[PDB]
Design a protein around this ligand. Structure first.
Ligand SMILES: Cn1c(Nc2ccc(C(=O)N[C@@H](CCC(=O)O)C(=O)O)cc2)nc2c1c(=O)n(Cc1ccc(Cl)c(Cl)c1)c(=O)n2C
Ligand SMILES: Cn1c(Nc2ccc(C(=O)N[C@@H](CCC(=O)O)C(=O)O)cc2)nc2c1c(=O)n(Cc1ccc(Cl)c(Cl)c1)c(=O)n2C
Ligand SMILES: Nc1ncnc(O)c1NC(=O)Nc1ccc(C(=O)N[C@@H](CCC(=O)O)C(=O)O)cc1
Ligand SMILES: Nc1ncnc(O)c1NC(=O)Nc1ccc(C(=O)N[C@@H](CCC(=O)O)C(=O)O)cc1
Lengths: 283, 284
């Protein structure tokens, strides 16, 4: 049977590592780190995720605030808030929770966060730095997927990795990290587009040593699609319950490793954000 | 038998479009576009490629200069020259021909070119904009591969593309463009890694509607790796004393539905797209 990797448990010990790094940095005489999160509107998924982020910040000794604004705010008002937080020497990390209302250009907002405070890694120069391996801050979800693979010990060097992506923003950063010269992953990588039918994806998945599903489609990954003992990482978030992309009971019979949803990649995203925030506070 | 796509012929159409775009722009009273190329040292392939670029510039109405420096140039003098050209208002496009001598850090050099003049798209800002679909300019070779596919009319949406890259810088931007939502192909893309087993790659190429080989090993792509009707695009450059691509051209010519030759395929398309990037930069 597949060994189940507890993302929650691994995230909790990464948080314990961050806490002691934070307490060391403060005992050494430095300002306690502070994370500011901007939340716009009433998306229930966004509010839940931001709650998990600020809870984790408390666990690791990082001060935090969630600044909640109504969905009717204008782009210029959001830019003014970001400029204020950019110039506030108490703020080490700044991220805007996405998605934003349609009258706000998401790309302009992310590029307005100071690159040094951009703990999500969404600023265009931080994206460029990540592609060129010139970075210091990785986006939290791809870095969390990498930490799962690395801390478990799943081999990548010369293996076949398949990533099924809902969008380029989701699958490509994951594949970027996994394809890169050794982070780094030194693996052959497929990034499947959502317009590729399930039957064609299957011919890619059956060859994969590592399957990473980020498609937001329930039951997209079933046991017939996986060679025996492959690692299956479920990033899908699907909604009166919450399910991933993987047929968990099904492929548990065939995979060598599997991550559950909830309790898998989700907690690792939050834990890697705390890593980025102590990184930002020390720069 | 495969259709043989003529890179020279498509590049000619693209260069005709740039010339018309340039003459109209000049007709309206604007400055003629100018491209500056910095060429360091005596790499014979680099000189040949830069000459192709400046010849294409002249025939489309774009002014050009190649600034040749010896390989023993220091990194500081190269940076000083780049800073001079960044501030020269006559210069719309600036590119540094790579590779540079070992004592020079090329990432520092590429990031020293003004992003507004970076017609190669190698500056870290422009790498990011390409990833985020914020760009004005695209790397010439990835954009050339895309135009070959798009202008020939080879379907990409939901199709299987394999890119066999010699490094991340080569394979990733090509894969990026083809994976992007429709440039952009909406395609599933495999990026095989350097030194990947030929039989391991075979398992992915067999499924591919489009095989893009950019690995620089002769005869990487033989017929037993292709499904019938597939499009094969040869980006390889190899000396064996003559230039050949990565594809066994005569062998794959039977199997494939489309094939590009080397020379005469991607090569001229790379040069032509740089001409597009240069008028884009001059237009700001
Ligand atoms: C701008 N952005 C975005 N936006 C975005 C995110 C979520 C939602 C949403 O609705 N999210 C859903 C689900 C969220 C989830 O997936 O958990 C919700 O919560 O309601 C809508 C928009 N997600 C990005 C980037 C970005 O910039 N980067 C840098 C990057 C780095 C390397 C490369 Cl190669 C590339 Cl391409 C991009 C990224 O890594 N991610 C991942
Ligand atoms: C820094 N660089 C380099 N260097 C480089 C190029 C050629 C040679 C050489 O010796 N070339 C030989 C072999 C032939 C050939 O290369 O044509 C020669 O010319 O004689 C040596 C070094 N090539 C890059 C980038 C880069 O920055 N970008 C942006 C980019 C955009 C999106 C993404 Cl995702 C990424 Cl990762 C990167 C790129 O697209 N290419 C393609
Ligand atoms: N949208 C964004 N804008 C800006 N920066 C970002 O990083 C994002 N993306 C996220 O914030 N993604 C995210 C997804 C799930 C969790 C999470 O905590 N999942 C739990 C609980 C499940 C649930 O509450 O439904 C689990 O899986 O166990 C946390 C973050
Ligand atoms: N190194 C770089 N540094 C900075 N920016 C770049 O873009 C590059 N890369 C190139 O400039 N790549 C390139 C390769 C071949 C041709 C070409 O014209 N090929 C001919 C044969 C030519 C011959 O061998 O004489 C053909 O195939 O028909 C043109 C450009």
């Amino acid at each position: 049977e597949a060994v189940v990797i507890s993302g929650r448990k691994l995230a909790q010990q990464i948080k314990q590592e961050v806490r002691q790094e934070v307490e060391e940095w403060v005992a050494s005489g430095n300002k306690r780190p502070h994370l500011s999160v901007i939340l716009v509107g009433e998306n229930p998924a966004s509010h839940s995720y931001v709650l998990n982020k600020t809870r984790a910040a408390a666990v690791v000794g990082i001060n935090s605030e969630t600044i909640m604004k109504p969905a009717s705010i204008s782009e210029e008002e959001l830019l003014n808030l970001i400029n204020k937080l950019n110039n506030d020497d108490n703020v080490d990390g700044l991220l805007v929770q996405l998605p934003l209302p349609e009258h706000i250009d998401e790309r302009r907002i992310c590029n307005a966060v100071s690159p040094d405070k951009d703990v999500d890694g969404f600023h265009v120069i931080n994206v460029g730095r990540m592609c060129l391996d010139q970075y210091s801050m990785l986006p939290a979800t791809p870095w969390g997927v990498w930490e799962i693979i690395k801390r478990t010990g799943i081999p990548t060097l010369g293996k076949n990795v398949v990533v099924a992506g809902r969008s380029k923003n989701v699958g490509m950063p994951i594949a970027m990290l996994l394809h890169t010269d050794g982070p780094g992953g030194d693996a052959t990588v497929t990034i499947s587009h959502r317009y590729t039918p399930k039957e064609q994806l299957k011919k890619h998945t059956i060859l994969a040593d590592i399957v990473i599903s980020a498609a937001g489609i329930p039951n997209l990954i079933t046991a017939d699609m996986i060679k025996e003992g492959a690692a299956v990482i479920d990033v899908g978030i699907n909604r009166p319950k919450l399910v991933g992309d993987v047929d968990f009971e099904g492929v548990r019979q065939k995979a060598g490793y599997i991550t559950p949803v909830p309790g898998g990649v989700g907690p690792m995203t939050v834990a890697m954000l705390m890593k980025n925030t102590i990184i930002a506070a020390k720069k």
